[PDB]
Write a protein that holds these residues in place. Sequence first.
Motif, PDB file in Angstrom:
ATOM      1  N   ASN A 264       0.790  -1.225   0.000  1.00  0.00           N
ATOM      2  CA  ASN A 264       0.000   0.000   0.000  1.00  0.00           C
ATOM      3  C   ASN A 264       0.821   1.273   0.000  1.00  0.00           C
ATOM      4  OD1 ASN A 264      -3.143  -0.841   0.920  1.00  0.00           O
ATOM      5  ND2 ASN A 264      -1.517  -2.340   1.312  1.00  0.00           N
ATOM      6  N   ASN A 364     -13.963 -10.658  -5.733  1.00  0.00           N
ATOM      7  CA  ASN A 364     -13.870 -11.861  -4.909  1.00  0.00           C
ATOM      8  C   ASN A 364     -12.680 -12.717  -5.329  1.00  0.00           C
ATOM      9  OD1 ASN A 364     -14.564 -13.948  -3.052  1.00  0.00           O
ATOM     10  ND2 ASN A 364     -15.765 -15.013  -4.643  1.00  0.00           N
TER      11      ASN A 364
ATOM     12  N   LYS B  86      -5.801   4.422   9.305  1.00  0.00           N
ATOM     13  CA  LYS B  86      -7.266   4.605   9.205  1.00  0.00           C
ATOM     14  C   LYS B  86      -8.070   3.528   9.947  1.00  0.00           C
ATOM     15  CE  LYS B  86      -8.324   6.252   4.740  1.00  0.00           C
ATOM     16  NZ  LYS B  86      -7.879   5.022   4.068  1.00  0.00           N
ATOM     17  N   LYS B 175     -15.577  -1.573  10.325  1.00  0.00           N
ATOM     18  CA  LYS B 175     -16.127  -1.011   9.092  1.00  0.00           C
ATOM     19  C   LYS B 175     -17.640  -0.938   9.269  1.00  0.00           C
ATOM     20  CE  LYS B 175     -15.787  -2.092   4.250  1.00  0.00           C
ATOM     21  NZ  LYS B 175     -15.814  -1.225   3.033  1.00  0.00           N
ATOM     22  N   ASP B 206     -20.136  -8.831   6.526  1.00  0.00           N
ATOM     23  CA  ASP B 206     -19.434  -9.293   5.345  1.00  0.00           C
ATOM     24  C   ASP B 206     -18.017  -9.544   5.833  1.00  0.00           C
ATOM     25  OD1 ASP B 206     -21.013  -9.172   2.794  1.00  0.00           O
ATOM     26  OD2 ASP B 206     -21.426  -7.156   3.562  1.00  0.00           O
ATOM     27  N   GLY B 226     -12.111   2.250   6.804  1.00  0.00           N
ATOM     28  CA  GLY B 226     -11.040   2.606   5.890  1.00  0.00           C
ATOM     29  C   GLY B 226     -10.530   1.453   5.054  1.00  0.00           C
ATOM     30  N   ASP B 227     -10.746   0.237   5.540  1.00  0.00           N
ATOM     31  CA  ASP B 227     -10.327  -0.965   4.833  1.00  0.00           C
ATOM     32  C   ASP B 227      -8.823  -1.129   4.648  1.00  0.00           C
ATOM     33  OD1 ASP B 227     -12.932  -2.409   3.699  1.00  0.00           O
ATOM     34  OD2 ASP B 227     -13.251  -0.237   3.577  1.00  0.00           O
ATOM     35  N   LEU B 262      -9.056 -18.003   1.817  1.00  0.00           N
ATOM     36  CA  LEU B 262     -10.091 -17.014   2.099  1.00  0.00           C
ATOM     37  C   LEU B 262     -10.959 -16.623   0.903  1.00  0.00           C
ATOM     38  CD1 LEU B 262      -9.519 -16.790   4.983  1.00  0.00           C
ATOM     39  CD2 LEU B 262      -8.444 -14.568   4.654  1.00  0.00           C
ATOM     40  N   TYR B 263     -12.256 -16.453   1.146  1.00  0.00           N
ATOM     41  CA  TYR B 263     -13.198 -16.022   0.114  1.00  0.00           C
ATOM     42  C   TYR B 263     -14.243 -15.140   0.800  1.00  0.00           C
ATOM     43  CZ  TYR B 263     -16.624 -19.461   1.834  1.00  0.00           C
ATOM     44  OH  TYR B 263     -17.499 -20.149   2.647  1.00  0.00           O
ATOM     45  N   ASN B 264     -14.851 -14.227   0.050  1.00  0.00           N
ATOM     46  CA  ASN B 264     -15.839 -13.312   0.610  1.00  0.00           C
ATOM     47  C   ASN B 264     -17.218 -13.912   0.786  1.00  0.00           C
ATOM     48  OD1 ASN B 264     -14.594 -10.184   0.289  1.00  0.00           O
ATOM     49  ND2 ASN B 264     -13.626 -11.811  -0.921  1.00  0.00           N
ATOM     50  N   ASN B 364      -1.343  -3.295   6.175  1.00  0.00           N
ATOM     51  CA  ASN B 364      -0.431  -3.303   5.034  1.00  0.00           C
ATOM     52  C   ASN B 364       0.226  -4.670   4.872  1.00  0.00           C
ATOM     53  OD1 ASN B 364       1.232  -2.382   2.872  1.00  0.00           O
ATOM     54  ND2 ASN B 364       2.890  -1.867   4.319  1.00  0.00           N
ATOM     55  N   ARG B 365      -0.567  -5.725   5.027  1.00  0.00           N
ATOM     56  CA  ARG B 365      -0.069  -7.092   4.889  1.00  0.00           C
ATOM     57  C   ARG B 365       0.941  -7.525   5.961  1.00  0.00           C
ATOM     58  NH1 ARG B 365       2.116  -8.306  -0.878  1.00  0.00           N
ATOM     59  NH2 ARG B 365       2.246 -10.409   0.035  1.00  0.00           N
TER      60      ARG B 365
END
Lengths: 376, 376
Positions: A264, A364, B86, B175, B206, B226-227, B262-264, B364-365
Amino acid sequence: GETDLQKILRESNDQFTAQMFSEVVKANPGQNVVLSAFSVLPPLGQLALASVGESHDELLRALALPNDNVTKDVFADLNRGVRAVKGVDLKMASKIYVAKGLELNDDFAAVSRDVFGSEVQNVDFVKSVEAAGAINKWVEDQTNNRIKNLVDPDALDETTRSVLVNAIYFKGSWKDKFNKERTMDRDFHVSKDKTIKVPTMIGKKDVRYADVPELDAKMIEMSYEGDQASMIIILPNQVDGITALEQKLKDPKALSRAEERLYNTEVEIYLPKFKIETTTDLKEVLSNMNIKKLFTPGAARLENLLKTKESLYVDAAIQKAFIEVNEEGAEAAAANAFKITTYSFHFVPKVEINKPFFFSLKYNRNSMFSGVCVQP
Amino acid sequence: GETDLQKILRESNDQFTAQMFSEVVKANPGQNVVLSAFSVLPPLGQLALASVGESHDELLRALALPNDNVTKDVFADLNRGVRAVKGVDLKMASKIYVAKGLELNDDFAAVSRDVFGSEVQNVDFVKSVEAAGAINKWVEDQTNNRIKNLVDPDALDETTRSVLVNAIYFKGSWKDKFNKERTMDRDFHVSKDKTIKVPTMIGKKDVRYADVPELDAKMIEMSYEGDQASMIIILPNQVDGITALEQKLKDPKALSRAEERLYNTEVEIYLPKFKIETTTDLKEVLSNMNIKKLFTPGAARLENLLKTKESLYVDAAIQKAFIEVNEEGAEAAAANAFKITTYSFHFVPKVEINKPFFFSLKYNRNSMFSGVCVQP
């Protein structure tokens, strides 16, 4: 479980997308192109359920799927979560039209709509022009009239048995909008010796960036409203590096490798606006991807599509894709006026997308569509 | 380039975090624990720049870094982007205190503040209680009084040469907030035979989900405003699987492997509120991680810290971490009343975090901190 189903789907779309991408790019040198392997998978899965013997194994093989049981479960699960998608307007329509005098298998038609969400219907091809008008009207209806003339009346015969049409439209809303007033004509290098001036949007944005030596390019990822979808842009370091990148993108894992480098940051982005519309002859592309039987009379064996199990094959398969990219986004310029913060100045690098580049929509963790822009 | 620098940092924090995690968890069986390897790296990098010979190689080795040149560039770059972050309130403070009668090297003090953002200062340890009060006051100031009593007056001697203190505080803003009125006492299985009732927040959200057979657990990822930051939760399938998971988490790649799954999706989450405060003896932990010379008189060789290059080593190193997790979040319940949509009902699975679980903050990972909660 759902975790494993989503995984199989991801892997399948990954290799299929790479395969389809090379085929389309190969047949359209030096031209803008946009395509979607994702929107094609469902109808191909529905077709694999209707086939038997060789044609069926071929379809499954190309889909990188084990069997019908798993095939149904994958797309069912998909259609158990397919509504709109936040921050973007993404429409994908699929449908199979078969000659008027062919009795449809009532059951296969049910499974078609709910499982694969792709319909099947009779139309009188004998009246070619009327049939084309019928097919083109349904597509217009599925895409808010955004897409039209998917099938040309000429391409249809009075002897047509069936036709597969695929349409995909897209327009998104940036998590952070570009200021229309800031857009201006800037240089774009189409070739090492040709330069044109195209409208270019300018804005400072939080993105995911990475230098990728393997692909000799720079990767950028911008997100849309809602943070579910993102636009991936890969800009080759060289003006003519676009073709070299295309070759690298054949391996369905080059993209995965590049993304592992993403981090980022903030940059000043110079991105040309653009709209690409591509009509792809899926019959030609898929055949080159080893899917031939499905289009060969007396070889398709779609014995589950018709009630009388009469012999039938696919005459034509067409995908029409229209992509639109502009300034539209959330939070207007005058949102919070005066943001009182330090008097200092960080350095913000300038990233200028001014050479033939590759792009891809990610939702996704799946690429909804991909393509190349060589002339905005 | 920055891409490579961020990568080195990521890799370093990954293996260091795994290493530190096992050490702390090992010394605190059956207890809540929170720790941060990330907040420790900078002071260790500043210490590697001040050392020579063996002690210096040891520090670098453990940091998984090549040399001083790269070490400076990594943390410099970090401090070229370190402001707030954020949606969350994340405070991390580091500082080195050395005896009053030891002349500090003016240059090393400059590089300390800007490059590593970790300060160095003199304090009179002869007046132990006053020194402790001084050190504890600075920490209170760095954490809005959220953290206090980092160092106990007893732990200090009149003969103390230097002390390294590390403090990290966290509270985030979801969020999508949880509704306070919805929070209620629900069962929590502390052991296979003990069950208690703890306040549990309930909400449909979500998230990113995945079943992970390798770790015999379920992984969930929730995002903050902010995600940019997210809370990772790994819930073992078994009530006593927490220890088995800890062993698996030793490999700095088990987490990376799980995340690839991982999946949404949407789920009904049952998450206990909790606040964990841990005081870690970094001298004990780091020594077990092969960093000993730095704490051995006549072996540290911090010849660049003092102007007279007088011999000096670290007497004590303390990290105090306080984590707070509750309902706070964006968009109150009554945001958009009546959302008129289909009359239908999708199935929303129920995910109940009611057994000892592992958690980690990802920014940031990079994992800002991690820990286990066995008793909310």
